[PDB]
Structure formats: C-alpha cells, structure tokens
Amino acid sequence: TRIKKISIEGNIAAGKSTFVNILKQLSEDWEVVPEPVARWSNVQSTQDEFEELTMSQKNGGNVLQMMYEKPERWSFTFQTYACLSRIRAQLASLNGKLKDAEKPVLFFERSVYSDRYIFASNLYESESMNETEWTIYQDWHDWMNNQFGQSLELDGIIYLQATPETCLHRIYLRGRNEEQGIPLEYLEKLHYKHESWLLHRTLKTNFDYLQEVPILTLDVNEDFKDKYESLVEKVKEFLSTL
Amino acid sequence: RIKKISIEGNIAAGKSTFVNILKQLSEDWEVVPEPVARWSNVQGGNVLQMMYEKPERWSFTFQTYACLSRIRAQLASLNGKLDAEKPVLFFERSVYSDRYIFASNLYESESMNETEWTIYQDWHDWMNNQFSLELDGIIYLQATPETCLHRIYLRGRNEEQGIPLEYLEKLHYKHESWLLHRTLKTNFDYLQEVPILTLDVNEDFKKYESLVEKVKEFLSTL
Ligand SMILES: Nc1ncnc2c1ncn2[C@@H]1O[C@H](COP(=O)(O)OP(=O)(O)O)[C@@H](O)[C@H]1O
Ligand SMILES: Nc1ncnc2c1ncn2[C@@H]1O[C@H](COP(=O)(O)OP(=O)(O)O)[C@@H](O)[C@H]1O
Ligand SMILES: Nc1nc(=O)n([C@@H]2CS[C@H](CO)O2)cc1F
Ligand SMILES: Nc1nc(=O)n([C@@H]2CS[C@H](CO)O2)cc1F
C-alpha cells in the first residue's frame, strides 16, 4: 500500500527497540510494530466474551524459556508461534495505523524473514529441529507468505550491527530473565547468519525481491549518545531513497 | 456460492468411501479428501506415525500440520473446479473437528500440555479468522467404535493397526457430544445454525440406497 515498510534487523540486545522507539518520535508519520516477545514469555489465548467478565487472564506458559531450556523439544513449537504472532501484529498495524499520514513509514522490529532464515534455520543447523520439523515449518512459512502477496513485502531493511560481545553485555544490562544463561557461542552463530543475509548478502531465500531490497547497515557498538546523531542522518537519507 | 458440506465421523466410519460414491451423482459435486497421504509422507518423515508412537512429543506438531494441510486443500478447491449450476463441495472433515475433536482429545489425554494447547487454539483462532470455508451443512456418519475398529483392519493402513478400541470410544463420545447431543461448544457462533444430517453407516454397504437419497435431498433444503 502507501505505507513504506522498513524492518529493523539485528541480534538479540543489539539495541533495535531502543533505537527505533526514539527514532520514530522524529515524525508523526512514523510508527513501530514491536516484536511480540512478551507474548512468548507469557503464552495466552483469547478469552470467551462472558468468561472474561468474571475470570482474569492468567499467566500462561513460558514457551521462550522452554525453548532455551530444551531446544530439541521446543524449537519447532516456539518458531511456529513466534512467526504467527509476528505476522498477526504486523498485519493489524498495517491495516489500522498511519491512516491520516502524508508519508507513512511503518518500522517492523524484525521480520518473517529473520524468523525463518536466522532463527529457525540456526535451530535446524543445530539439530534442534529435525528434518520433519524443518520441512513442516518451511511449508507453513511459504504458504502463509504466498497468501499475503505484497502485503508485508519490505521496502527497506536497516541492519543494526553489533558484536556478539556487545549483545551479550546488553542482554545483561536489559536483564530479561530468560536470556540470562545465553552463551556467547549462540549469539555468535546468530551474528554470522545476520552477516551472510544482510552484509555479505550471500544467503539465498525463497523470496526473490529480497535480493534487491535496499539495506542500510548501522554500527551500533558505541554508547548511544556517541553515534545517534549520525545514525539518524543516515536513516533519513536512506528513507528519502525508497 | 459453492455449498460447502463437511462429512464428519470416526476413523474408518466410511467417509471417504461414501463421498467418493456421492461424488458421481452430479458433475456439480466435488470432494476435498482428508490429506492423510501428506501426513504419512511429509514433503519424508511419517508425522502421523510419529504422533501415534510418541503422542506426548508429536501431537502438537501433527495437529498443526494436519489443520494447515486441510485448510490449504479446501481453499485450493474453492479456487476453481466448479461455472456450475448448483455447486457442492464435500469436505472430508473440517477445521472444527481438527480442534474440537482430535486436538481437544489429545489435550484431554495429556498428549498436549497447557502451553501447547494454548498455542494451538491461538494459531487456530488466527488461521481460521483470515481463511470462506464456512459450512452450509454437515453430514455425520455414525458408526460404533467396534465397527470403526473392524474397518480399520479392513483398510489396513499401517499407522493405524495398533489403535485400541478405547481411543475410538473417546473419539466417538466427542463426535456424539458435538453432532448429536449438541453439547459441544465452539467459539464459532454460526455453527449452531448449520443443519446436521446424521446417517447410520454401521451396516454393510448393501443401506446405501436410502443414504444417498437422504443426502441428495438434505442438500435441496440448503
Ligand atoms: N547504543 C547503546 N548504548 C548503551 N545501551 C544500549 C544501546 N542500545 C541499546 N542499549 C541497551 O541495551 C539493552 C538492549 O537494547 P534493546 O533495544 O532492548 O535490544 P533489542 O530490542 O535489539 O533486543 C537495553 O538495556 C538498552 O537500554
Ligand atoms: N458401509 C460399509 N460396509 C462395508 N465396508 C465399508 C463400509 N464403509 C466403509 N467400508 C470399508 O471400511 C474401510 C474404512 O472406510 P473409509 O471410507 O476409508 O473410512 P474413512 O474415510 O471414514 O476413514 C475401507 O476399507 C472401506 O472399504
Ligand atoms: N523467531 C525468533 N526466534 C528466536 O529465538 N528469537 C530469540 C528468542 S526471543 C529473542 C528476541 O530478540 O530472540 C527471536 C525470534 F524472532
Ligand atoms: N486432526 C486430526 N487429528 C488426528 O489424529 N486424526 C486421526 C489420525 S489420522 C486419522 C484419519 O482418519 O485420524 C485426524 C484428524 F483430522
């Protein structure tokens, strides 16, 4: 549609939510679809219309934690749910926000492509999904994407590049409970997937237009004040090109 | 404008048989078979078998793929093969029996945990709510669990050969609660309005005259 869709990609705790949520104050025509991580650590489904008047919406399972604890059991289930909740949030925001905007830009915290080609794929490569799980996942992912056509197609990607060591430190700073045992090696594997996809651009996907989508790579290893001015200038220049 | 009728009933009640027969009565009638071949050869792995052998491990993966694969087949069949006077599409089962019979039963038996069941409902809610498949009517083929158990052996699907009577009793009570007693509640409000034709298929196929005529004309009321 008229809404430009820009995905913000980068490793866990690179600083995507921080950067984008400050950035988007620069324009009333700019909005963000946050990644549904809260929904993964407290798994809930919709209450009946009458039941919710007399029953609380209780805390459900922690599928994020289950995946970290036993990835060979929970990876498929986690990845399925992560992508479904993402698509759901991105579509609803597409169809409902920025209606009265002159040059609307919707920023996505990550995309369905990072779900598959970074996160799920890394789990398949780690033998945390077997051939059957990997086949089911890709089949479902392809199907959903063909269903939407150009709906979610990206106009641009901003890659926030941080070292695995930076991300590890920032995981500690943020203090999300389920992330606290994450080892450097896991971040490193994820780092490598981001570099292949977004920087060296050697990673091949089932979605041909991606080979051509413009990418802005930003180095976010510095303390926030130290580069923010220059990053904002780069983003504004990049967007003028789309 | 295609009438959509689902055929519901226990494993080996005889849904595929009956509808393949019914199919031939009119050029305006087509069938969407349950994608069971896709389930025993994932394209590969036999996720149907994986689920029967280790249901606590594989039930959620199986259920999700079973429902996905069904939705896909049903949508594709609407998308052009019936430019017909009065088109009817007969579905072998529905996304409702996926959730409210099979998946629910697996949850009830603890083959899915609370998280798995919540994820599955949430996925099923969203998946359905986009993807057109609403039923005009349901035909319920009612066979005793002992009949179904016999017919499992007749058909000889390898993945099915160990199925116990008790498991079929459980599925039978679910179907009965949904389609006969009507005590099974779904979060699909329109389903309370859908007419149900219940047909007893326990005898050897030589009541089939009576049953076809009863369908032929249940349809004329829709
Ligand atoms: N440039 C930066 N300098 C110092 N801290 C940062 C910087 N960017 C992000 N942070 C901090 O790092 C942590 C993770 O950032 P966050 O934006 O939540 O990451 P993401 O959304 O990419 O997972 C937070 O505690 C945040 O305050
Ligand atoms: N009424 C019937 N009388 C005798 N055999 C039947 C009858 N209905 C089905 N069968 C046989 O029983 C088996 C199960 O039928 P099928 O149509 O495959 O069941 P479903 O599609 O309900 O799983 C098949 O071998 C079929 O030929
Ligand atoms: N599909 C995804 N799988 C993941 O494991 N993650 C991990 C676990 S949640 C954390 C959020 O940044 O990253 C993210 C995804 F988007
Ligand atoms: N959603 C379903 N789950 C199942 O286990 N089954 C079982 C296992 S395959 C057999 C086909 O009759 O029935 C069917 C479904 F439609």
Compute the Cα dihedral for A193, A198, A204, A205 and give only its sign: positive
C-alpha of residue B62 to centroid of ligand 4, in Å: 9
**CA-nearest residue, atom 1 of ligand 4:** B98
- Answer yes or no: are the C-beta atoms of A94 and A154 closer than 8 Å: no
> Which H helix or E strand runs over B210?
helix B208-218
- Total domains, chain B: 1
The DSSP line for A80-126 is: HHHHHHHHHHHHHHHTTS-TT-SS-EEEEES-HHHIIIIIIHHHHHT
Residue type, A111: S
The Cβ of residue B108 has, within 10 Å, a number of other Cβ atoms equal to: 12
- Answer yes or no: are the C-beta atoms of A240 and A4 closer than 8 Å: no
CA B184, CA B10: separation in Å to the nearest integer? 16
DSSP SS3 for B3: strand
In this structure, what token pair is assigned to residue A43? 């798994």
Using CA atoms, how far residue B96 sits from A35, B23, B46, B70, in Å, is 30, 23, 24, 11
**Which residues is A161 bridged to in the sheet?**
A219
Q: Are the beta carbons of A135 and B44 separated by less than 8 Å?
A: yes
CA A216, CA A9: separation in Å to the nearest integer? 10
CA B9, CA B3: separation in Å to the nearest integer? 20
In this structure, what token pair is assigned to residue B148? 């179904």
A224-241 helix and A16-23 helix, angle to the nearest 10 degrees = 70
Q: What is the CATH number of the domain that holds B60?
A: 3.40.50.300
DSSP SS3 for A4: strand
DSSP SS3 for A137: helix
CA A159, CA B129: separation in Å to the nearest integer? 33
**Which residues is B63 bridged to in the sheet?**
none
**Residues composing chain A:** 242
Q: Edge to edge, what strands does the sheet with A4-9 contain? A: A30-33, A105-109, A4-9, A156-161, A215-219
- Residue A153: name the closest of A194, A207, A200 by CA: A207
The Cβ of residue A206 has, within 10 Å, a number of other Cβ atoms equal to: 13
The method recorded for this entry reads X-ray
First CA to last CA distance, chain B: 12
B163 pocket-lining for ligand 2 (C-beta < 6 Å): no
CA atoms within 13 A on the CB side of A8: 27
What's the gap between Cα A60 and its chain centre? 22
Q: Are the beta carbons of B43 and A147 separated by less than 8 Å?
A: no
Nearest to A132 among B42, B72, B116 (CB): B42
- Answer yes or no: are the C-beta atoms of A156 and A106 closer than 8 Å: no
CA A109, CA A38: separation in Å to the nearest integer? 13
Residue type, A154: L
Task: Please return the burial class of A82, using the count of CB atoms within 10 Å of its CB with bins 0-12, 13-18 and 19+.
Answer: buried
CB neighbour list of residue A95: distance below 8 Å, 6 or more residues apart:
none
The DSSP line for A147-181 is: HHTTSS--SEEEEEE--HHHHHHHHHHH--GGGTT
B165-175 helix and B145-155 helix, angle to the nearest 10 degrees = 120
- Answer yes or no: are the C-beta atoms of B8 and B138 closer than 8 Å: yes
- Answer yes or no: are the C-beta atoms of B133 and B75 closer than 8 Å: yes
B154 pocket-lining for ligand 2 (C-beta < 6 Å): yes
DSSP SS3 for B5: strand
CA B59, CA B50: separation in Å to the nearest integer? 8
**Residues composing chain B:** 222
DSSP SS3 for A1: coil
Ligand 1: which residues within 6 Å by Cβ?
Answer: A 10, 12-18, 170, 173-174, 220, 223-224
Using CA atoms, how far residue A218 sits from A86, A158, A196, A230, B140, in Å, is 24, 7, 16, 10, 60
DSSP SS3 for A47: coil
Domain region containing A71: 1-242
The Cβ of residue A16 has, within 10 Å, a number of other Cβ atoms equal to: 26
Compute the Cα dihedral for B204, B210, B213, B215 and give only its sign: negative
Task: Please return the burial class of A163, using the count of CB atoms within 10 Å of its CB with bins 0-12, 13-18 and 19+.
Answer: middle
Q: Edge to edge, what strands does the sheet with B29-32 contain? A: B29-32, B88-92, B3-8, B137-142, B196-200
> Which H helix or E strand runs over B185?
none
- Residue A2: name the closest of A88, A98, A90 by CA: A98
- Answer yes or no: are the C-beta atoms of B195 and B138 closer than 8 Å: yes
Using CA atoms, how far residue A129 sits from A119, A153, A185, A233, B116, in Å, is 11, 27, 18, 41, 17
CA A231, CA A219: separation in Å to the nearest integer? 9
**Inter-residue long-range contacts of B176-183, CB under 8 Å, 24+ positions, other chains counted:** B178/B8, B178/B96, B178/B97, B178/B100, B178/B101, B179/B8, B179/B138, B179/B140, B180/B140, B180/B142
B148 pocket-lining for ligand 2 (C-beta < 6 Å): no
- Answer yes or no: are the C-beta atoms of A84 and B126 closer than 8 Å: yes
Listed in sequence order, the DSSP H helices in B79-207 are 95-97, 104-108, 114-130, 145-155, 165-175
- Answer yes or no: are the C-beta atoms of A41 and A64 closer than 8 Å: yes
Interface of B with A (CB under 8 A): 42-45, 47, 50, 57, 60-61, 64-65, 68, 72, 113-116, 118-119, 121-123, 125-127, 130-131, 187
CA trace torsion A48, A50, A53, A55 (10° rounding): -60
CA B93, CA B76: separation in Å to the nearest integer? 16
In chain B, % helix, strand, coil (3-state, to 5) comes to 55, 10, 30
